[PDB]
Short mmCIF file of C-alpha atoms and ligand atoms in Angstrom, two decimals:
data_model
loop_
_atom_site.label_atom_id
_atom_site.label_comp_id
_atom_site.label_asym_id
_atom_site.label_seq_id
_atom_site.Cartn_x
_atom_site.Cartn_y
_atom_site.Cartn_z
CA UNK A 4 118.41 43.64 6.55
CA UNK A 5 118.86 47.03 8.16
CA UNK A 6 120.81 49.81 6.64
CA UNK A 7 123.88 51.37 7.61
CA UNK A 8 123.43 54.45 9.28
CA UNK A 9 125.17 56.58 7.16
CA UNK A 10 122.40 59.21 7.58
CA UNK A 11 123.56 59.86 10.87
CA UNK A 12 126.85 60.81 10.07
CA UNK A 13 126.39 62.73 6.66
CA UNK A 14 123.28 64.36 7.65
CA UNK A 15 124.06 65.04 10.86
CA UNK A 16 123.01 68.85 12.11
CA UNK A 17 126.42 69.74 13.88
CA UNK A 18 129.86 68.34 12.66
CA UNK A 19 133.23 68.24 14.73
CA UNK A 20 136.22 70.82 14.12
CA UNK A 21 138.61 68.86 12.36
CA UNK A 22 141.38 69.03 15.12
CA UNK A 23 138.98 67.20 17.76
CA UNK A 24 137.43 65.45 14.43
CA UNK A 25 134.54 62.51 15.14
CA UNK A 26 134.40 58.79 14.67
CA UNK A 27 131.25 56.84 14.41
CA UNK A 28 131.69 52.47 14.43
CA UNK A 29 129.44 50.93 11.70
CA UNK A 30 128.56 47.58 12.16
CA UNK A 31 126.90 44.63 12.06
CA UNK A 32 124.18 46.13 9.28
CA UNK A 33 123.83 46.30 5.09
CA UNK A 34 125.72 48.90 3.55
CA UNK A 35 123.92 50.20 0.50
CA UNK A 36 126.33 53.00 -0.75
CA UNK A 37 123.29 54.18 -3.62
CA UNK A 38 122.45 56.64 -1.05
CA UNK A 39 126.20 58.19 -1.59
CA UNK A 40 126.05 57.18 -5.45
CA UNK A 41 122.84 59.08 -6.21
CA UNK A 42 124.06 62.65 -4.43
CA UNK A 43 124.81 64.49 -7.77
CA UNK A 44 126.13 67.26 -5.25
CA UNK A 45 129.55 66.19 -3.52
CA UNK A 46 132.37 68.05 -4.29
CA UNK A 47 134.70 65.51 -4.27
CA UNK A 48 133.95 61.38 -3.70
CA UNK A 49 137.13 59.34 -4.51
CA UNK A 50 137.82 55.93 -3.47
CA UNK A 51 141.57 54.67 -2.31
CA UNK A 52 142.54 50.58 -2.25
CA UNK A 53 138.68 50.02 -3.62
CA UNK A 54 136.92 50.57 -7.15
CA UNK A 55 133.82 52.84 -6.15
CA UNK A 56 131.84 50.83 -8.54
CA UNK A 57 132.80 48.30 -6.20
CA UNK A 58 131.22 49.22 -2.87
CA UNK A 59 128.34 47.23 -3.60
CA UNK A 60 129.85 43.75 -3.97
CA UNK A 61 131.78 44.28 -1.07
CA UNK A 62 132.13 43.42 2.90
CA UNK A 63 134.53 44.43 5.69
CA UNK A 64 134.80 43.94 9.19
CA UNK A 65 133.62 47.21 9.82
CA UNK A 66 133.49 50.52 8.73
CA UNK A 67 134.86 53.67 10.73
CA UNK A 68 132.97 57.28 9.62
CA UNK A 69 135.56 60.49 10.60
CA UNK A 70 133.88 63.41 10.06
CA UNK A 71 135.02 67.31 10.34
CA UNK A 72 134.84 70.97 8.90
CA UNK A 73 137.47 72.53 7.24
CA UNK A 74 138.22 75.44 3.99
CA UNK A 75 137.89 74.39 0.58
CA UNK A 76 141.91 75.11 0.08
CA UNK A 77 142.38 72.27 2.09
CA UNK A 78 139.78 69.56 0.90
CA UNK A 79 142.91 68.36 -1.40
CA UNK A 80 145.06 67.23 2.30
CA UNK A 81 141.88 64.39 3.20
CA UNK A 82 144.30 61.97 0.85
CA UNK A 83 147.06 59.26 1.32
CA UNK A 84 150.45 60.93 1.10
CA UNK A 85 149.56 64.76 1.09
CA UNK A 86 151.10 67.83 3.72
CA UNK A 87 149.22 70.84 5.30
CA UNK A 88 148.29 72.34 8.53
CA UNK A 89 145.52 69.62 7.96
CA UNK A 90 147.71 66.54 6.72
CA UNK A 91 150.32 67.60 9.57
CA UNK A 92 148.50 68.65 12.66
CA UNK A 93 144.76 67.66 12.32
CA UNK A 94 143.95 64.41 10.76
CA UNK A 95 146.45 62.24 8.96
CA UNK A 96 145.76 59.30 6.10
CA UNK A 97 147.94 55.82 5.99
CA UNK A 98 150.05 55.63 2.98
CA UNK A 99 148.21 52.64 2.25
CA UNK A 100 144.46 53.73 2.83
CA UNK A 101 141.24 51.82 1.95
CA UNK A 102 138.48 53.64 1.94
CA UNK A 103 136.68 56.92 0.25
CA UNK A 104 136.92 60.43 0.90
CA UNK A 105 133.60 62.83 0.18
CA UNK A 106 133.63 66.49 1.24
CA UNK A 107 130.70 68.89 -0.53
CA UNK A 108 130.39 72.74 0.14
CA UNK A 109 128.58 73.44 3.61
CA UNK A 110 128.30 77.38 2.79
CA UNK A 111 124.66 77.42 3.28
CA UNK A 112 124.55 75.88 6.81
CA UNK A 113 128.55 75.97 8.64
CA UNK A 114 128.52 80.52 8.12
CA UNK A 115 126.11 82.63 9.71
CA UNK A 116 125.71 86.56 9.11
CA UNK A 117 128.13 87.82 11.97
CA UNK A 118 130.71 84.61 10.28
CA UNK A 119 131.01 81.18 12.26
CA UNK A 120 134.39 81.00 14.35
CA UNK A 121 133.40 77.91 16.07
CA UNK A 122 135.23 75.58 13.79
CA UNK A 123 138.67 75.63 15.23
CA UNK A 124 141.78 73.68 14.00
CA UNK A 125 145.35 72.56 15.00
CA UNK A 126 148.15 75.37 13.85
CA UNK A 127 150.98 74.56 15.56
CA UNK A 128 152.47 70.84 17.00
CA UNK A 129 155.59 69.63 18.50
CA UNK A 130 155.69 66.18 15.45
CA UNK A 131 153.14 65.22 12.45
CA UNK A 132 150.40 62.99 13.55
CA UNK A 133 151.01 59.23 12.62
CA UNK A 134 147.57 58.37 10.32
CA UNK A 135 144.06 58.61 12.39
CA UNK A 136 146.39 59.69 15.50
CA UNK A 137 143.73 62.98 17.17
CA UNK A 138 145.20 65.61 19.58
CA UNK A 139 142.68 67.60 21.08
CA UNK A 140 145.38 69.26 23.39
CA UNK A 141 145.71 73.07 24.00
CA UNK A 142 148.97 73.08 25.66
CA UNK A 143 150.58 76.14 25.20
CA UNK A 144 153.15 75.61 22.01
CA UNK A 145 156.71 76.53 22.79
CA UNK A 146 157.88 77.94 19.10
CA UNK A 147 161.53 79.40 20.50
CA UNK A 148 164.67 78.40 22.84
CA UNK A 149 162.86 79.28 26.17
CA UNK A 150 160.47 77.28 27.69
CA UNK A 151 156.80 78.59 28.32
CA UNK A 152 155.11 77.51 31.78
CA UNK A 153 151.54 77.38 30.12
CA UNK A 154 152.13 80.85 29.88
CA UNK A 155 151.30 82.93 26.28
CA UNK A 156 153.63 85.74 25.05
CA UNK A 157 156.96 85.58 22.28
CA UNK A 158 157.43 82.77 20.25
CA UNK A 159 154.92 80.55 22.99
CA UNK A 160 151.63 80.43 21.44
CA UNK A 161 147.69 78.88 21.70
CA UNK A 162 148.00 75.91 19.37
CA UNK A 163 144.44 76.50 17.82
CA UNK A 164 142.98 79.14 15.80
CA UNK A 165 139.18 78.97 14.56
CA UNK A 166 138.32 79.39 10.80
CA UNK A 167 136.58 82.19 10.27
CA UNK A 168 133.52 81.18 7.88
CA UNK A 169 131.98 84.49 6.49
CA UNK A 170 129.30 84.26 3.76
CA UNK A 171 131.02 86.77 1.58
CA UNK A 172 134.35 84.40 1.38
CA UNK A 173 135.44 82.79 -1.15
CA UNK A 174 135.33 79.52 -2.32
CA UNK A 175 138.72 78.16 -0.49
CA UNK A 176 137.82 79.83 2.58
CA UNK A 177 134.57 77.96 2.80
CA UNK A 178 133.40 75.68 4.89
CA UNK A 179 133.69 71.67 3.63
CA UNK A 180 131.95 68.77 5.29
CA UNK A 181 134.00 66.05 5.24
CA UNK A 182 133.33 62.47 5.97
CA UNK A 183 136.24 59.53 5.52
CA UNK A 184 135.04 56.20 5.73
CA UNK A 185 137.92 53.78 6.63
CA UNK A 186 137.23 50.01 5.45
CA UNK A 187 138.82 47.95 7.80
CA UNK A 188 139.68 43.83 7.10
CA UNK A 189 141.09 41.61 9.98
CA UNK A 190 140.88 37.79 10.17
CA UNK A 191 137.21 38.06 11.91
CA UNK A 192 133.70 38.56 10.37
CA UNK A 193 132.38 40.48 7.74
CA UNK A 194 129.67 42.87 9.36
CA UNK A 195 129.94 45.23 6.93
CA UNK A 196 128.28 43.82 3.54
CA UNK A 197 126.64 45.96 0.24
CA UNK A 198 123.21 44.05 -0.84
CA UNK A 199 125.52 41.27 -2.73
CA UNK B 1 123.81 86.06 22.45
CA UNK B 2 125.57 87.45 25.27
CA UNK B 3 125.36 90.60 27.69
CA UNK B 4 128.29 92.60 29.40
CA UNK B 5 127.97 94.47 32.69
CA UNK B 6 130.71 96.85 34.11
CA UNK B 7 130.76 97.91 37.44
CA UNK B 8 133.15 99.70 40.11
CA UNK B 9 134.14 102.65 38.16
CA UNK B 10 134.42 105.93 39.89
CA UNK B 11 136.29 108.48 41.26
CA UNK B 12 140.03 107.94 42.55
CA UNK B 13 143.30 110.33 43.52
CA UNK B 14 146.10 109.87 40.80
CA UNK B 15 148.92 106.83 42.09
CA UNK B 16 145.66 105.34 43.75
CA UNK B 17 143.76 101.82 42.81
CA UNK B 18 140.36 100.84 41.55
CA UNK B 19 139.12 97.32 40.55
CA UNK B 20 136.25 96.83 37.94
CA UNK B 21 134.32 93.47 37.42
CA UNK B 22 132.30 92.92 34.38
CA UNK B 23 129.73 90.00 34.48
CA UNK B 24 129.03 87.94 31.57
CA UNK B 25 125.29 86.48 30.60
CA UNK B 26 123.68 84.23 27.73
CA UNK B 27 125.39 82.05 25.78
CA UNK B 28 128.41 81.89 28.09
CA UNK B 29 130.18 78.79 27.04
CA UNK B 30 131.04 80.84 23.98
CA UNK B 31 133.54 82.81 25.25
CA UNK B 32 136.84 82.58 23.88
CA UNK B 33 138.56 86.08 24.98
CA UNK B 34 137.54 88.80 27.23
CA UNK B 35 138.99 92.38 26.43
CA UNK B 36 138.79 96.28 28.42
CA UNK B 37 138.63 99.09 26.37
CA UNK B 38 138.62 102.63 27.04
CA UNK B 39 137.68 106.04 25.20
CA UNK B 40 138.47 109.41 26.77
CA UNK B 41 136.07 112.27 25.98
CA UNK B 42 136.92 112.81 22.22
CA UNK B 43 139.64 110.56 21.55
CA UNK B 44 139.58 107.14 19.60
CA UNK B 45 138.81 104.02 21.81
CA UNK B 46 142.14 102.21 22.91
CA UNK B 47 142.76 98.64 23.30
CA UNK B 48 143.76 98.13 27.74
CA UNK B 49 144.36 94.61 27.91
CA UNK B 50 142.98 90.84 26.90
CA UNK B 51 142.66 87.68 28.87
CA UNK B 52 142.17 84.14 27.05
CA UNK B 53 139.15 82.46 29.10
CA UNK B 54 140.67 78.94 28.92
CA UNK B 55 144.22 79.00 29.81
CA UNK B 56 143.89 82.76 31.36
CA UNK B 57 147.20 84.35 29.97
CA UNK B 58 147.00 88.37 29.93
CA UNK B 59 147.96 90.91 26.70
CA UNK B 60 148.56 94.43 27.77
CA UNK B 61 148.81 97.73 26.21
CA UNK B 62 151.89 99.66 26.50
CA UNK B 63 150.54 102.47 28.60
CA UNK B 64 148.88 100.09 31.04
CA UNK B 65 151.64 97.40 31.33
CA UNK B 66 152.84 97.30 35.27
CA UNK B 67 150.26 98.70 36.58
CA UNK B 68 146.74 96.83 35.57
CA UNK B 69 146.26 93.29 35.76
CA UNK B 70 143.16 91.52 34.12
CA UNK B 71 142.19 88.44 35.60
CA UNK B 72 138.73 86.38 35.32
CA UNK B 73 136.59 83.17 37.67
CA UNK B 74 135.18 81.02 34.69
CA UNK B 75 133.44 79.79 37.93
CA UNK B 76 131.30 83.29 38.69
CA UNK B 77 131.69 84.03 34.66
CA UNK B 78 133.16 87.50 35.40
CA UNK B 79 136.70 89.25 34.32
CA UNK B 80 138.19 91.75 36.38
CA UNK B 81 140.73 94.55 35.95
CA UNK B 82 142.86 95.86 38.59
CA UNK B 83 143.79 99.47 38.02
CA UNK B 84 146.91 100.56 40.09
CA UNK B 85 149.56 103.88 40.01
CA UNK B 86 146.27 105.51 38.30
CA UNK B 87 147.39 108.53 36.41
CA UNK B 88 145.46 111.62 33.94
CA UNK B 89 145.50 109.27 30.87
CA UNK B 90 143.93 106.53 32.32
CA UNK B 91 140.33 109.21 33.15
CA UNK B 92 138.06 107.56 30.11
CA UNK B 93 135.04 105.51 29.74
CA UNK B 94 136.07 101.54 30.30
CA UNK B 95 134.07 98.63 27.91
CA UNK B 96 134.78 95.20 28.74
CA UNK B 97 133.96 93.20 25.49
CA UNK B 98 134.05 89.31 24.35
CA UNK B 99 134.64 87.25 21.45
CA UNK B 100 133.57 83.94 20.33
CA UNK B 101 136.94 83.81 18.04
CA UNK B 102 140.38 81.91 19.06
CA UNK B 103 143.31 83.60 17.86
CA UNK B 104 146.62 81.91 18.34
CA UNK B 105 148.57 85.25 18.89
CA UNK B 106 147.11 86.65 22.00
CA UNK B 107 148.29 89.94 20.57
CA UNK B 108 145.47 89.65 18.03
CA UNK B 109 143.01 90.66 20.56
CA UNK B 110 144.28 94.44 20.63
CA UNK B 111 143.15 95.00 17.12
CA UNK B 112 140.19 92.08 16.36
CA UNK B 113 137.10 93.16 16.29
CA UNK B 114 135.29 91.57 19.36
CA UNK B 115 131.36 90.27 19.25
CA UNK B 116 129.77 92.25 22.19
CA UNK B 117 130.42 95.25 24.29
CA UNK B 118 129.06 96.89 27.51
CA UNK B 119 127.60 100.02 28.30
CA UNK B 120 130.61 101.00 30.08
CA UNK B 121 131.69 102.62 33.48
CA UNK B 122 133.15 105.93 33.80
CA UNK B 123 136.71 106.12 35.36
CA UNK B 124 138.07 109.97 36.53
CA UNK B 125 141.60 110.77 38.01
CA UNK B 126 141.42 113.57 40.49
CA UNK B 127 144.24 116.31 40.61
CA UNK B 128 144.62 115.28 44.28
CA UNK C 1 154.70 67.14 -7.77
CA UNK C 2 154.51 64.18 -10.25
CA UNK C 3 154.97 65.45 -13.83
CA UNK C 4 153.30 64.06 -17.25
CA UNK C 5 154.13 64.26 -21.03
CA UNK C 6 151.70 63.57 -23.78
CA UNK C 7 152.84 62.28 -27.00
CA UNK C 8 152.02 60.42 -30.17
CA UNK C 9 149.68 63.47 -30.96
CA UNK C 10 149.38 64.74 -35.19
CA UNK C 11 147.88 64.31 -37.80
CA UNK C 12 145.87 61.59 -39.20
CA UNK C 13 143.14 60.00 -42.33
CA UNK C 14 139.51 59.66 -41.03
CA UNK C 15 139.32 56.17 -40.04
CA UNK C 16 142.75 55.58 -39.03
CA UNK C 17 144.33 54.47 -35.89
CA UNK C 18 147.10 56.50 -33.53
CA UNK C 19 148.50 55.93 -29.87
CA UNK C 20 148.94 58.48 -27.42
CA UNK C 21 151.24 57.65 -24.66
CA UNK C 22 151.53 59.82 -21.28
CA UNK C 23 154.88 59.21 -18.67
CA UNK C 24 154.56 60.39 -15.34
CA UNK C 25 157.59 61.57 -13.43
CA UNK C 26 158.16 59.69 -9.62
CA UNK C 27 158.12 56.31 -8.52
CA UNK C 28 154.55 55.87 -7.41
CA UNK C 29 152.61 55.59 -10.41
CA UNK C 30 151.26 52.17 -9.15
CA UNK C 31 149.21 54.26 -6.73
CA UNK C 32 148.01 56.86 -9.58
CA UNK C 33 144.48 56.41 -11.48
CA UNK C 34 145.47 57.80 -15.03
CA UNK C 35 142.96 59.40 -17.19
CA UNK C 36 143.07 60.87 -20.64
CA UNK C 37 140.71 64.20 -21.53
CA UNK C 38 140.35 66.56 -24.35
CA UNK C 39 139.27 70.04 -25.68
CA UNK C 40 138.37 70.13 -29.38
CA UNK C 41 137.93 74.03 -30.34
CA UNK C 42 135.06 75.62 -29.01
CA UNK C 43 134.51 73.54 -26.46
CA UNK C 44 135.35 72.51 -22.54
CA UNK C 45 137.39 69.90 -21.29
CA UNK C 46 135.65 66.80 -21.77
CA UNK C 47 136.43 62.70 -20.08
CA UNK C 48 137.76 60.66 -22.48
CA UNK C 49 138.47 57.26 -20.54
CA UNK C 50 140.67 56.68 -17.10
CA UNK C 51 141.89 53.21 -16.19
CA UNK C 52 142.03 52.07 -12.27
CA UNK C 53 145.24 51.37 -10.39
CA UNK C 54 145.32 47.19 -11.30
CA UNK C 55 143.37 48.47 -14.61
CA UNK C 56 140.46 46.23 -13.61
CA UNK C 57 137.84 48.93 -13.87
CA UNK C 58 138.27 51.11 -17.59
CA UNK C 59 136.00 53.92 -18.34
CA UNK C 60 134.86 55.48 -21.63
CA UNK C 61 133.32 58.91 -22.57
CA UNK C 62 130.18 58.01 -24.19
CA UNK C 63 131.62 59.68 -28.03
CA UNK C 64 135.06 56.74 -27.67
CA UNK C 65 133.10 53.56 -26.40
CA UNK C 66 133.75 51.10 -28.41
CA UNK C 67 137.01 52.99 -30.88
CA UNK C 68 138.98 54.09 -27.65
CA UNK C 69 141.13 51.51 -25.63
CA UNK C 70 143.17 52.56 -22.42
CA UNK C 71 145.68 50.80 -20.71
CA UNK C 72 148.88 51.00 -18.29
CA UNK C 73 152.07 49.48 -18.12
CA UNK C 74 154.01 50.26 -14.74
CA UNK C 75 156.79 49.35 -15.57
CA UNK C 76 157.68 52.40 -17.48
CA UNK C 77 155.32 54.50 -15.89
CA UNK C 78 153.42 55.18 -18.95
CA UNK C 79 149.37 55.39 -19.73
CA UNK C 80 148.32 54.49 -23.25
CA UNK C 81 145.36 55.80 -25.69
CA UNK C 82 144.58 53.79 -28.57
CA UNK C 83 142.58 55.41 -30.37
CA UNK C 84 140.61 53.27 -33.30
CA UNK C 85 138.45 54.32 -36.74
CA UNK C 86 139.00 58.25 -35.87
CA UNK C 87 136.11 60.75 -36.64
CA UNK C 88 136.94 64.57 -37.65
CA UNK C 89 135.15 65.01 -33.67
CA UNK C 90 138.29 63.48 -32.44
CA UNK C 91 140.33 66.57 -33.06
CA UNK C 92 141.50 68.36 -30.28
CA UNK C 93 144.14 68.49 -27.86
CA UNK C 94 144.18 65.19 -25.80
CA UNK C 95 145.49 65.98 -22.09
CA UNK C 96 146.64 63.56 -19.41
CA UNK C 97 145.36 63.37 -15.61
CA UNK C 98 146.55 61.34 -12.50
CA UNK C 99 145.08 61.52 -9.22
CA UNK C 100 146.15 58.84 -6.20
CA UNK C 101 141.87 58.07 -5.78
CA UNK C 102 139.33 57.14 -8.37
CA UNK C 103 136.67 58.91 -8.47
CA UNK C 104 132.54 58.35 -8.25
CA UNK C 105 132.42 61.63 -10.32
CA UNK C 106 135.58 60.04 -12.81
CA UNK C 107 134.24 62.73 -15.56
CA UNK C 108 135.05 66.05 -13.85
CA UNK C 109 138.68 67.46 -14.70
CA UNK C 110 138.57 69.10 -10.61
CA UNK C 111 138.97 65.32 -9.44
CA UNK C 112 142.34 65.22 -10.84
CA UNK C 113 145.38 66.55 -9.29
CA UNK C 114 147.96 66.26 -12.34
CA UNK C 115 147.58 67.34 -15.80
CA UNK C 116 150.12 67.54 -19.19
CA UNK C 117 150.09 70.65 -21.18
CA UNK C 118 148.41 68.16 -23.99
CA UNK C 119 149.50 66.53 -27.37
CA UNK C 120 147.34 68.25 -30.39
CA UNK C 121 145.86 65.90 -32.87
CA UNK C 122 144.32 66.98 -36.02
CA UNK C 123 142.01 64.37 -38.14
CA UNK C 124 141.28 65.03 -41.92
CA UNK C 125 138.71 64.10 -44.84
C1 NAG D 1 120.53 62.74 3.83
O1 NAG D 1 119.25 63.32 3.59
C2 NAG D 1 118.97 63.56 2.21
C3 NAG D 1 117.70 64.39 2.09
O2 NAG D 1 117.86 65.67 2.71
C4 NAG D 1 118.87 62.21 1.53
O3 NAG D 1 118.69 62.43 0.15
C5 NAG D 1 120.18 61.44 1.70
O4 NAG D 1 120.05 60.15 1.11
C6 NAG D 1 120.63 61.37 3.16
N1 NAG D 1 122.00 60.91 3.21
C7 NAG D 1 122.32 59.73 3.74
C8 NAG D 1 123.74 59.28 3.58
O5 NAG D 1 121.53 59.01 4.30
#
C-alpha cells in the first residue's frame, strides 16, 4: 500500500557526479509511475525491454535508481549500445537493458553565479567499464611509455576533470539530472508491483 | 567561501632562502588546487607554481623551477613555498590563491582563473 | 550510424490508399522503435504513428487514427505506412525515425536518434 520512493531520488536536493554516480534499492512497496507520467517537463523519458504504457501492469523483483549530473551533449550516451567519455569511463548500459532512462534540464538549480565545478567526471581509463561497473578511483593515468609513480607531469595525468556549469552556457554544456531505473527479474518475488 | 593568509615574507640576501605558509579558512573541503602568484611593482602578475590538494603533485614556472618547491599538510590546511638561490626577479608581492575546479592537466593551473586570493606578502632581494 | 530510406511517396486521388515503406541500414533493427512523421507546408514536424519493438504497442497522431496503419517486418528491416481514405491535409513530406527506446513523450521528433531525408506525397481534388 505504500509508494515507492521515487521522490527521494528524483527530487532529491544534491545529486552524485556521474563518475562516483548513486544507487538507491527499491523494494518491497507499490510503484505508481503517474508521478513520472504526469511531469510534462523531462527532457527525455524512454523505456528499453518495457512498453512505458506498461509500467503500470507490471512487477519486478526490484528496482535499482542510478542517478548523476552530466552536459546536455551527453544525455544521448545514458542508452544501450552508445560510446562517450560517459558510455566509456563513467556509467555503462547492458546491451540488453530493461528499464527507462529520464534526464530533464537542471540549469536553474546544478549552476550558480561564479559557475558550479563540483560535478566532476571520469576523462581518462586504462579499459571501458563493463555495464553498471563504477570507478571512483583517482589514480594517476599513465597516457605514454613511462610509468608514473602517482606522480603528475607528461603524458601522466589526474583522471577527472569537473564540468564547469556556468549560467551563460549553452544548452549542451548544461547541467542534466539523470535518473536510470534498472528493472531487475530473478526466480524470487515480485516486490516491485504498479497498482495492477 | 574561503579566506587566504600569507605569511613569512620579508627581507633576504640574493642566493639566500625564505619559506612562506599561507593558511586556508571556510569552506575548506573545497579545495581542489592551491597556486602562488607574484607581481613586481608595475609588471603583470606571474603564475610561480601549483600544487593539487589530493594527490599533492607540483607545476612550476620556468623561472622558479629548481629552486622553489610548493608543498601543503591537508592536516593543518596550509600550503607552503620554499624559496631557495633567491635572485632580483624573484623581489615582488606573493598571493597564494585556491580553486574549487579539477583540471586534469596540472599545467592548467598557470593560466585558470582561481576562486580566491590573499592579501599578499611582500618579498625583497637585497644587493648583498 | 543506422541509415533509412523513405519510399512509396507521390501523388494520389482524395480518398485513395498508398504505402510508404522505410529500410534501415544495420543488423539491429529488432532493437529499433520505428516511427513515421511529417511536415505539410507551413508547418512543423508533426507524429504520425511509431510501432514498438514486438509491435505490441502502435501509436497514432490524433489527424491518422483510424485511416493510418503501421507495422514492421524484421525480416527485411523495413517499417510500413498504410495510409487509408487520404485527405488533401495528408500532403507533405512523410519522414522516418528510429530510436533503440520508446518513448513516454513518443510525439517529439528530439526523442529520435535517426531520421530519412523524407518521401514527398502530394494528394489532389
Ligand atoms: C517531486 O516534487 C514535485 C513537486 O515539486 C512533484 O510534482 C513530483 O511528483 C515529485 N516527484 C516524484 C517522483 O515524487
Amino acid at each position: 500500500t505504500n509508494l515507492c520512493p521515487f521522490g527521494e531520488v528524483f527530487n532529491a536536493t544534491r545529486f552524485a557526479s556521474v563518475y562516483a554516480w548513486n544507487r538507491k534499492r527499491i523494494s518491497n512497496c507499490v510503484a505508481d509511475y503517474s508521478v513520472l507520467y504526469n511531469s510534462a517537463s523531462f527532457s527525455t523519458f524512454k523505456c528499453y525491454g518495457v512498453s512505458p504504457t506498461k509500467l503500470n501492469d507490471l512487477c519486478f523483483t526490484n528496482v535499482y535508481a542510478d542517478s548523476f549530473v552530466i552536459r546536455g551533449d551527453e544525455v544521448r550516451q545514458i542508452a544501450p549500445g552508445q560510446t562517450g567519455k560517459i558510455a566509456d569511463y563513467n556509467y555503462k548500459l547492458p546491451d540488453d537493458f530493461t528499464g527507462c532512462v529520464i534526464a530533464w534540464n537542471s540549469n536553474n538549480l546544478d549552476s550558480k553565479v561564479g559557475g558550479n565545478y563540483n560535478y566532476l567526471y571520469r576523462l581518462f581509463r586504462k579499459s571501458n567499464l563493463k555495464p553498471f561497473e563504477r570507478d571512483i578511483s583517482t589514480e594517476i593515468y599513465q597516457a605514454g611509455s613511462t610509468p608514473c609513480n602517482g606522480v603528475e607531469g607528461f603524458n601522466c595525468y589526474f583522471p577527472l576533470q569537473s564540468y564547469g556549469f556556468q549560467p551563460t552556457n549553452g544548452v549542451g554544456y548544461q547541467p542534466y539530472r539523470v535518473v536510470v531505473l534498472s528493472f531487475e527479474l530473478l526466480h524470487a518475488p515480485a516486490t516491485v508491483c504498479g497498482p495492477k | 567561501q574561503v579566506q587566504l593568509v600569507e605569511s613569512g615574507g620579508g627581507l633576504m640576501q640574493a642566493g639566500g632562502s625564505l619559506r612562506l605558509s599561507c593558511a586556508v579558512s571556510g569552506r575548506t573541503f573545497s579545495t581542489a588546487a592551491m597556486g602562488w602568484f607574484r607581481q613586481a611593482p608595475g609588471k603583470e602578475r606571474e603564475f610561480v607554481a601549483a600544487i593539487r590538494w589530493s594527490g599533492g603533485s607540483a607545476y612550476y614556472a620556468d623561472s622558479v623551477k629548481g629552486r622553489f618547491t610548493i608543498s601543503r599538510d591537508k592536516a593543518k590546511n596550509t600550503v607552503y613555498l620554499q624559496m631557495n638561490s633567491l635572485k632580483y626577479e624573484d623581489t615582488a608581492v606573493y598571493y597564494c590563491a585556491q580553486t574549487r575546479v579539477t583540471r586534469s592537466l596540472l599545467s592548467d593551473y598557470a593560466t585558470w582563473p582561481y576562486d580566491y586570493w590573499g592579501q599578499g606578502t611582500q618579498v625583497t632581494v637585497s644587493s648583498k | 550510424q543506422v541509415q533509412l530510406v523513405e519510399s512509396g511517396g507521390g501523388l494520389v486521388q482524395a480518398g485513395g490508399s498508398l504505402r510508404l515503406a522505410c529500410i534501415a541500414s544495420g543488423r539491429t533493427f529488432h532493437s529499433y522503435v520505428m516511427a513515421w512523421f511529417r511536415q505539410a507546408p507551413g508547418k512543423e514536424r508533426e507524429f504520425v504513428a511509431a510501432i514498438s519493438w514486438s509491435s505490441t504497442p502502435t501509436y497514432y497522431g490524433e489527424s491518422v487514427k483510424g485511416r493510418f496503419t503501421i507495422s514492421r517486418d524484421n525480416a527485411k528491416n523495413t517499417v510500413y505506412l498504410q495510409m487509408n481514405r487520404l485527405k488533401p491535409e495528408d500532403t507533405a513530406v512523410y519522414f522516418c525515425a528510429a530510436d533503440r527506446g520508446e518513448s513516454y513523450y513518443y510525439t517529439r521528433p528530439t526523442e529520435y536518434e535517426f531520421w530519412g531525408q523524407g518521401t514527398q506525397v502530394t494528394v489532389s481534388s
